[PDB]
Every structure is written in structure tokens, then in C-alpha cells.
Amino acid sequence: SRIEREQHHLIESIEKSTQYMAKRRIGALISVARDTGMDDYIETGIPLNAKISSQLLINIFIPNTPLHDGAVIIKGNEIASAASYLPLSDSPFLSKELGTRHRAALGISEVTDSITIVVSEETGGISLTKGGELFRDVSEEELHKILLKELVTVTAKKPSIFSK
């Protein structure tokens, strides 16, 4: 496969699934691994090793289901695990009206270079964490630009399965 295609499909899959869940107030927590590995947190969840799709991301987070209680971790071109533990931030700067999903997303962002996306159970707002910072209630346009900048690392070049 071709990474550029993989990376844009990942972005689209996050955008479509979080849009779907935001409209319905479905809580979600999706962490995308980058240069810092998250293998230890993958091991805490239920292994999926699945192809990335918006449909599977949505089905995972349906409330009161086996896979919904925790984080999804995406590693390379797979949904690696669901219902994974992430470390909680102890920061007193995180607003008290945000839930544990936000605290978990902040916590993993403080110890990895991962990009984590949260859909709020209470408001449907979409938030993102990176490097110990929270980007709260981002618009669809803002989410798109952030994901483009952080998850697409290849410019326009010749497609090839050997790219890596």
C-alpha cells in the first residue's frame, strides 16, 4: 500500500467518525501513535489489529458495549486496540467540567508525541491533545487542518508501495 493514501484515509476516517459521534453525543477517545511508541498501552486493551475505517471507529464507541470503555489506539495503518488504558493527567489546569476522556487524552499527550482526539459525552464537542496542550471544541475546519499538519508527513510525490 501507499502511505500517502493511508495517511489521508486515516484523517478522513477520524473526521467522519468523530462527526458521526459528535452529532449523537457519543463519547470517544482515539489516540494516534507517531514517533513515540504506545505498545504498552496497546497491550492494556482488546486487540483488534483491524483495517482503519470510519464505520469500525463508530461501532467501537457505541455506549454500553464491550469495546467502548477506554481508548482506541491507532498504530501505523491499523486500529491496534480498543478499551485501552491511557495515563491520566494530574494537571490542575484542566477544566473541572471536562471528563476523564479529556484527562486521559491530556495524560498520554504529556508522555508521548501521539495525537489524541476526544468527542465529549456531554457536549459533543471535539477536542485534541498534543504535547501537554488541549485544543478544546475545535471546528470541523480546525480539526481538519490540525490532522493534516500532524498526521500527513508526505508531500505530493510518486505513489509506490515501497515508500515507508
Q: Output the known binding site.
A: 69, 86, 99-102, 120-122
| Residue bearing cell 487524552 | 105
d(CA 120, CA 72): 15
Part in contact with Cl ion (CB under 5 A); list of ranges 9-17, 63-71, 94-102, 103-111: 94-102
Q: Is 147 exposed, middle or buried (0-12, 13-18, 19+ CB in 10 A)?
A: buried
3, 70, 72, 116: which one binds ligand ADN (CB under 6 A): 70
**Torsion-angle region of 116 (φ positive above 0: left; ψ -120 to 50: alpha; else: beta):** beta
Annotated binding site for ATP: 69, 86, 99-102, 120-122
Part in contact with ligand ADN (CB under 6 A); list of ranges 9-17, 81-89, 122-130, 139-147: 81-89
Nearest-CB residue for ligand ADN: 100
d(CA 30, CA 96): 21
d(CA 103, CA 100): 5
Kindly determine how many residues on this chain lie close enough to bind ligand ADN according to the rule CB under 6 A.
Answer: 12
Q: Classify residue 89 by its DSSP letter.
A: P
14, 26, 29, 33: which one binds ligand ADN (CB under 6 A): 29
Give the contact letters, 98-117, x = binds to Cl ion (CB under 5 A), - = no. Answer: -x-x----------------
| Residues at the interface with ligand ADN (CB under 6 A) | 27, 29, 69-71, 85-86, 88, 99-101, 104
